[PDB]
Amino acid sequence: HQVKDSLEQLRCHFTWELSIDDDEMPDLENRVLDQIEFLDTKYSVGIHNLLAYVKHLKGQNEEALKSLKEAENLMQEEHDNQANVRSLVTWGNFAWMYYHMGRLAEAQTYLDKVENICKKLSNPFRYRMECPEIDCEEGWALLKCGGKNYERAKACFEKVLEVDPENPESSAGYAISAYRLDGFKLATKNHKPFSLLPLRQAVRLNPDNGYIKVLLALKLQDEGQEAEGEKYIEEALANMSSQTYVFRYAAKFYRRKGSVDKALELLKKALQETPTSVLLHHQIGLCYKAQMIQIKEATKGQPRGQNREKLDKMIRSAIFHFESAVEKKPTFEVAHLDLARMYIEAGNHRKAEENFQKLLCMKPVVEETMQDIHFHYGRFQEFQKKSDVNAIIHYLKAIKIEQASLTRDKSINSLKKLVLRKLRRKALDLESLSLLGFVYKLEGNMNEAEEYYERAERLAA
RNA sequence: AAA
Ligand SMILES: [Ca+2]
Ligand SMILES: [Ca+2]
Known part of the structure; x- marks a missing residue:
């Protein structure tokens, strides 16, 4: 042996x-x-x-x-x-x-x-x-093999930096790993930019690396320093190295800035080089989504003629690209969620439902993504299916995932609005009374909460 | 890689 x-x-x-x-x-x-x-x-x-x-x-x-x-x-x-x-x-x-x-x-x-x-x-x-070279190699292998591996990857690079704090390669690996881990937490309450200082140091120590610069730019944009970030975008775009990579992340930067046409031009160039990239297909879909929203807002929701044909082009193009992403990576949970949401915009509720049902079975590395799955399914149930019963079920499932987040707050607010609506039709609906007490309890108003729970208990006579 |  x-x-x-x-x-x-x-x-x-x-x-x-x-x-x-x-x-x-x-x-x-x-x-x-x-x-x-x-x-x-x-x-x-x-x-x-x-x-x-x-x-x-x-x-x-x-x-x-x-x-x-x-x-x-x-x-x-x-x-x-x-x-x-x-x-x-x-x-x-x-x-x-x-x-x-x-x-x-x-x-x-x-x-x-x-x-x-x-x-x-x-x-x-x-x-x-x-x-240190092999610590780095272990880190890079982990970083390529999926988000489940990223705490381990970061620790590989950190081990090197604990001995050699100006090591360029591990500085870069540490910063990229930290950036992606920050992304997992980006919608959690009081999240912090742990990767920002690492990215600044990685750029200092790797001055020719445009990949790191575009991540620094994106984190600066996250932190409300878009103008400083754009300077790094321009530096990266002036260098010929690693273009599909510089272009994918610069395109995200420009999309989030509002320069959607520029983002699309970059993404279509990147797609010439890496046509199987699920990141590119997802980003392209998000660009069409943004343009769809622009059209709706310019026509106050009722495009006609050419505007309607443009809107339909955006919807079907986003569906095509989100479908392409999930065909290539069936575990890409948020691309399925964007796809389901776009089928709602296309008026295909059966395909929306299908994709939500797939999502409800997934086990994402980022556990909080299930809050968004339940929230958007709850909204689909409330507004497209006219099913308050199922909307309540899924708002409650989002809330039961306790991690404080943008979406958990929205789920509490959506449940409150739904229950208040039901009580205006039927002031003595016992289930709705206790749910309103629940909502007040989660908000902290304990006297109002107990009032409604009591009221609801009274009713049970 | 949505947010
Ligand atoms: Ca090259
Ligand atoms: Ca070969």
Whole structure:
């Protein structure tokens, strides 16, 4: 059992417990291929190793080996053949691949190669190489493999910064991980910009990196400093590196600024390079949604003639793009929610209902997204289905998710409005009386609350 | 990646 025990000591994709959902594998592979072709990084060993791991998980071990050989080939060709400790991730993945394929003598050869380097570098472990480069590689693998992995990814980069606070690579990984984690909390009450100072430092230490600049710009926009952020957008757009990536995030920036035409132009250019990107399709859909809203507000909700044809174009284009996003990544929960909401605008309540029903079964990494699912379904039930019974059920389910948020507040307010409406038709509706007491209780008005609960108890005679 |  010596071989397997040794393999478990290696630091590589096989031992990093990457959270990779089978339903997210097609999208992951597309994003890995996009990164190989279009993300300009100093080293590409990591991303080829991840492609090899993906091929392995697909049952394509020979294809996996080709990606590991490419990782080794690129290590020397683009860095003057110098020896680099990142190669140990590749060698670890070779050892595992050959173990799985039954090429056990070769597996041992790669273990021996790793051991030889750990000894040369006075590493304390025989196979587990302790160096910041491999902490970074572990972090980048985690960061690519889905939101479930992001606290772990951030901790990989943090471990490096605790020793070397001006390390450019881990500064960047820490900032990106922190930015995405801030995004998970962006609608929670009293959320804070933990990623802002990390992003400033990452830009300082990586001055040619336009990817980091556009994230800094977006966080500045979040924090009400749009003008400062736009300066970073312009710097990034002046650099040719990583364009689909600079363009996707700059397009978000411009959309949120209100320059929707500019956003769409950037996104359509990005789509030429990465047509499978679910982020691009979702962002394009959001641009059409914004233009739909613009048309409605200019025609006070009653477009006719060409304006109506334009509105329908926006609705059907947003549906097309949100459908494209969820076909490619069926676990993309918020794209389903935008899609359901757009089917309401198209007047297709059955397809809205279908997508809400799918959403109600999902288990999002961001648990608070279920508040929005219940809230918007409750509104659909109230306003499109004319079902107060089901609206109440789902407003209550949103409220039962206790985390304080924009949507939980809206759910309390929507329930209050619905119940007040029902009481104006029937002042002695016992259920509505107690629900109004519940609402007042959640708001803090304990005397008004108990009045209504009491009143409701009285009624039960 | 909605918000
Ligand atoms: Ca390039
Ligand atoms: Ca290739």
